[PDB]
Amino acid sequence: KMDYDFKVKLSSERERVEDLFEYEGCKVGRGTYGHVYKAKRKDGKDDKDYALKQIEGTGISMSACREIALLRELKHPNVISLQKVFLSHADRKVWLLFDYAEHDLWHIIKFHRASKVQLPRGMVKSLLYQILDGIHYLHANWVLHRDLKPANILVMGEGPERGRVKIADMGFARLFNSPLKTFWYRAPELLLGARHYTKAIDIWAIGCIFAELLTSEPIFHCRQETSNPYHHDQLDRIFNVMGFPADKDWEDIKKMPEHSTLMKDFRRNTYTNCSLIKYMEKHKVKPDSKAFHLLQKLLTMDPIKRITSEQAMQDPYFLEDPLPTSDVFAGCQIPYPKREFL
Amino acid sequence: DDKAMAGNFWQSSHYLQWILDKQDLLKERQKDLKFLSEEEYWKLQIFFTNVIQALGEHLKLRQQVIATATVYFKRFYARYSLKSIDPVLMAPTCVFLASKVEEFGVVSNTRLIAAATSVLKTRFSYAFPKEFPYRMNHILECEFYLLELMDCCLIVYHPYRPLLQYVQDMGQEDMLLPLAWRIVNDTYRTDLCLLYPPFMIALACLHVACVVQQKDARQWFAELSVDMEKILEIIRVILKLYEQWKNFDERKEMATILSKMPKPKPPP
Ligand SMILES: Nc1n[nH]c2ccc(C(=O)N3CCCC[C@H]3c3ccc(F)cc3)cc12
Known part of the structure; x- marks a missing residue:
């Protein structure tokens, strides 16, 4: 029941994690938190390593919601900084981009x-x-x-x-x-x-x-x-x-x-x-x-x-x-x- | 009790990204003003504010959670048209997402749908003849769209906390706090939360409460270091709201106005 024009336009424009980042075979972490990967940009504008975290589970849980909520506000040299949030619509997975x-x-x-x-x-x-x-x-x-x-x-x-x-x-x-x-x-x-x-x-x-x-x-x-x-x-x-x-x-x-x-x-x-x-x-x-x-x-x-x-x-x-x-x-x-x- | 990021407003996403220019707000509104009048549009905003309140009260959420959900809604329809996503779907999605920002108690899927169905049937049957048509999969889809627009900006600051500090500073909690707190509630019927910082809204509400109850506090307001012309602007919006309230019969008018809303077009 959403507007079609609105839906296709956002789908066209939405940055997908797999398109932006190369990370297959580059998993550096695995736990309750989810999956963490070392990642580089595919389109070579930046030249530095990034930590990609796929959150464990599906959708937006309380834990995912809190983590996004606070990391979006927190800014300090000695606390790890959220760079981007990718919401994958197909599989309902949340990805988070950090510096490596x-x-x-x-x-x-x-x-x-x-x-x-x-x-x-x-x-x-x-x-x-x-x-x-x-x-x-x-x-x-x-x-x-x-x-x-x-x-x-x-x-x-x-x-x-x-x-x-x-x-x-x-x-x-x-x-x-x-x-x-x-x-x-x-x-x-x-x-x-x-x-x-x-x-x-x-x-x-x-x-x-x-x-x-x-x-x-x-x-x-x-x-x-x-x-x-x-x-x-x-x-x-x-x-x-x-x-x-x-x-x-x-x-x-x-x-x-x-x-x-x-x-x-x-x-x-x-x-x-x-x-x-x-x-x-x-x-x-x-x-x-x-x-x-x-x-x-x-x-x-x-x-x-x-x-x-x-x-x-x-x-x-x-x-x-x-x-x-x-x-x-x-x-x-x-x-x-x-x-x-x- | 909700102390996370309390003293960070001036470096927060609320301030830096979600305090909007009034003329930019009015410019984006022109696309919906082709179908509705300016008056009709403001009445829709009042109506859906009451829907979010009624849902919140049904789920036993504290006022601050309800407010955050109201802001999420306003932020969505500041950017986009009413046709983009059905506001009947968005309102309970905003409440659902706002409730997950807290860690004291969780709102379940089955409980949300039950509340949406029950509130629209018992308290809003004047507007909606048919029952709530959306299941939980539509809420979970809508949540993703809502979160994406807001640029993942979930922590929202409100006038209740500064208001509480101001009335305690006066020494007039029993006298002024109940009335001032309801006036703060009423300001969510307007755009004020997108245009001004919360502490300014709280001062304006506290001024109106002093005028209503005939309490001389001119010296206390004089002792503050704040732009008083910005407060008088907010006061005039609050006084305007109560004249709108008087002349608006929500129950008689909202069915017709809801039919004038632009509708989401289906796929080809
Ligand atoms: N390696 C990282 N760079 N930036 C990050 C941002 C977050 C994370 C992350 O999720 N975890 C899991 C729990 C917290 C420690 C960290 C981590 C630590 C060691 C390890 F072998 C794999 C992962 C990693 C990085």
Whole structure:
């Protein structure tokens, strides 16, 4: 029942993804998010790599709608930028065009961990600062990430944006802002049954990433042990690193839904010789350093006592030599390999 | 509570792309004015605003979601003719798409169609003799066309949030807020949301509410740093609306006006 002239005119004019971009055999990613490809323009006006994401599913879901809605507004150098949306009418598929990041923290950290660490001086500091800058921009606009981890912290390769952090894969859709509807980067309050995502939950994750950048190992590493938030072995690992929190350290722990399950399962005497100081010393990081004192503020167990992203960016750590750089690689050669196609 | 992008209006897509020139709006309107008069066209806008309101109320959506859907509709028919897509199909599609921008609760397919069918039958039988003819596949097709026109611009700012800040600043919430809030609702019967930033619309509504209730707030309005001639422009549109309202019998007139609309031509 639509107007015919209107319908054919729009069909004539509508830019189709397959016509504009060459991407067959160039799949660099596959998950719940959907399909991600490395892509070049067929009509050779531009000469640079693009990330094409076909969203998983059909039509416009809540998740697709939210993601489009917010990425259309968000603009910041340390957050990944939506360039174009292609709506394929025949198969009802949504495609999203982004600039292409060759690297990410998961692969960078694995490359060092494979070696027998963070070879440019001040790469760790520069990464942390840009992560903090991107999250601060989101948080200022009341956008939570809600699933921060090394895999979705991208880093740009050779090109005009060399060694710039690009935060990606924001959890744009969660029903009622609720986690109840790996666990290595999940804040203790989420494990004890917190009903909502918060800014503080994103900050704990940055703290875990910061510990992993310094040491090359996930601070709260744990075996893959569920329709419930409570995860015993993940909590056990947090206490083995951090120690068990005193009443005075986290007064509102009693208000958490799984507190009576915590008391039932755990005895504090177990972790009496455990602390972040002792853990980081074993991995050759000095407790007197400004890096450590900032890490300890990021990894505070009580969410209300956890430092914000703004306050973290103001830390004297970033005023100490060496200073953060725009290019995290600091003009040095990039040893990390390119993305292999699937 | 809907805080996403709240303080970003001046760098938003709403401001940079969907605040239109009035003369450009009138120029695109001339193609539909060959069939309808200027008066008839404004009455259609009022009618379909009430249809979107009635759908929203039926689905238990909060006012802000209903407003966003109203804007999506207005934005579509600012660019294109009424013949291009049937506005009876577009209205529930706008409500459906607006509801998916929120993450607190979801509107189902079967529930949408049921609401569209029920509202037009119980509340708008003066305009529509026949039942809602569209199934869900038509909503899902229309959604794709709507999203494409809007250039994927989905976050819409409204006067309710600034209004709330202004009345709280006066210390006159119980006195002025209910009346000011309904006047904001009434401004969606007009083009105001395509022409002015929301905070200006909220100030105009709050001025009218003060005049109606005989509350001296001249000093408070003087303390603001804003273009007062732009507000007086908005005030005159609001006062004009209530004189249109008075002289318009929606129920008596809307069947005839709906038959004068240009119709979508079928394929060859
Ligand atoms: N490689 C990319 N450049 N620009 C992008 C914009 C988005 C995406 C993207 O969807 N994902 C999936 C989840 C977030 C991490 C990212 C990704 C990370 C590693 C990987 F091996 C494949 C994909 C990728 C790029």
